[PDB]
Amino acid sequence: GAVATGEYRNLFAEIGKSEIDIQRKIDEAFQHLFYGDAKDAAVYYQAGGNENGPLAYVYDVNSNDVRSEGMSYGMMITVQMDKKAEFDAIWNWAKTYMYQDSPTHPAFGYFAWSMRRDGVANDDMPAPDGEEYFVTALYFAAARWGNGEGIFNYQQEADTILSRMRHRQVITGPTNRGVMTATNLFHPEEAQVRFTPDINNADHTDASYHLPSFYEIWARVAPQEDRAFWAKAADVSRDYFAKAAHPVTALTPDYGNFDGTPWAASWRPESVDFRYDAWRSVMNWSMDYAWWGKDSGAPARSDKLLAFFETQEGKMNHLYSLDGKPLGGGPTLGLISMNATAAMAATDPRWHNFVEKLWQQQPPTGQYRYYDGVLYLMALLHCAGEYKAWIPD
Ligand code: NA
C-alpha cells in the first residue's frame, strides 16, 4: 500500500502528463474554486474574522447554504495542498458556527449539515461523512503543521470529536427543526457509521459514508480505548462494500441498511438507486485499496464499475438503478471525477480512459458547481498522487 511505501501513484503521469501540466491543472482548479469569480466560479467565501483569526467557508452556491460536507472537504483539500491559512479559516467557521457544544442539545458534538450564511442552522443534525472528514483532516493538519492551541490544537480537537462520535449518549431537546432525539454516530455493535444519529432513522447507513481508508488512520492515532473499534470499522466497511455494491456493475445505492441491502428513506425512496451520494463509493474503496492494500475485492469492484461506465459512452446519465438502467440526467463533472478515482484500484487498462476523461475537464461554473467542484478537486489530488495519509505522532 502507499502508506507503507510512501509512494503514491501519479495516475496522470502514468497516462503521459507532465508534472508541470499536472501542477497547473490542480492550481487552476484551486484558484477557480477558492478565488474565482464570486458569482460563477468560486465556492469559498472569506467571512471576516474573530478571536481565532480569519473565518471562511465553502458553500453550496445553489441553495446558498453552508454544508458540513463541503467544509470538511475544504479542510481535506487544503491540508493536502499545504494551505494552512485557508484550512484554519474554514475550521474556524465550522467550529464557531456549525459545531454544537451544548451537552444538553441533541446535536451535541456534531456539525450542522445545512447552515445559512448568517450562521442560522437549517438542520442541526449532521451529515456523518462530514464529521469523518473533519476528524481525519484535523489529524492530517496535526501531522503536517504541528499542533497549535485552542481550536488549532488539531490533534486534541480530532481526539475529542472522534471519541464523542463513538460514545455520544442519547439526548433529547429543542432544535431548529423542533424537538429531536439523537444518538451516537456509529452503531456500537455493528461498528458502522450511521446515515443519521436522529433516533427515528438511526439504524441505517450509507455506503458513501464508509471510509475505511480513514478508519485505519484512527485505528493508529485515536484515543487508545477506541482504536480496536476503528480497526473493526475498517474491516466491516470492506465487507460492506462487497455486500452493497451490485455484483455486476459495482453500483451502490445512496442509502443502505447495515446488512448491505438498499434502504428507501420515507422522505426519499429513490435512495435505493445510484445517485449523488453513491458517486463517491468507488473513491472510498479505491482510496482504501491504494493506501492499505487490505480490501482484496476493491480491484475487481473498480474494474466492474469502469466496465459498466464504458457501456454508457455517449449516453452517460448520472442516476442509475443498481443493475445499470439509466434513470436520468447527463454526465456530470462530479461523477466523471469519482469514476476516475476508481483507477486507484482498477487493473484493466480501460482506467486510462477514465483518467484522461478527468484530465479533459475544467473547473465547474454555474449553479451546480459546489458538489461537482469539491469532487473534482479531490479527484485531481488523488489522481495526481497528491492526496496522502499524513499520520500524526
Ligand atoms: Na453524551
Residue numbers in the entry: 5 to 397
Copy out sentences from the published article reporting this entry, exactly as the authors wrote them.
Here, we have studied a potential GH8 xylanase from the shipworm symbiont T. turnerae, the genome sequence of which unveiled a treasure chest of carbohydrate-active enzymes. We have shown that TtGH8 is a single-domain endo-xylanase with six catalytically relevant subsites that hydrolyses X6 to yield predominantly xylotriose. CAZY GH8 enzymes act with inversion of anomeric configuration and thus feature two essential catalytic residues: a base to activate the water for nucleophilic attack and an acid to protonate the leaving group for departure.
Given its possible relevance to xylan degradation and perhaps even marine colonization of wood, DNA encoding the predicted catalytic domain (residues 41–436) of the GH8 enzyme of the bacterium (TtGH8; locus tag TERTU_4506) was cloned into an E. coli expression vector. E. coli containing the recombinant plasmid produced high levels of soluble TtGH8, which was purified using nickel-affinity chromatography and gel-filtration chromatography. In order to provide molecular insight into its catalytic properties the three-dimensional structure of TtGH8 was determined. The three-dimensional structure of TtGH8, determined to 1.5 Å resolution, reveals intimate details of the substrate-binding sites and the distortions of xylose within the catalytic centre. PDBeFold analysis reveals that TtGH8 shares close structural similarity to the reducing-end xylose-releasing exo-oligoxylanase from B. halodurans C-125. The next closest match is the cold-adapted GH8 xylanase from Pseudoalteromonas haloplanktis with 35% sequence identity, an r.m.s.d. of 1.4 Å over 341 Cα atoms, a Q score of 0.6 and a Z score of 14.7.
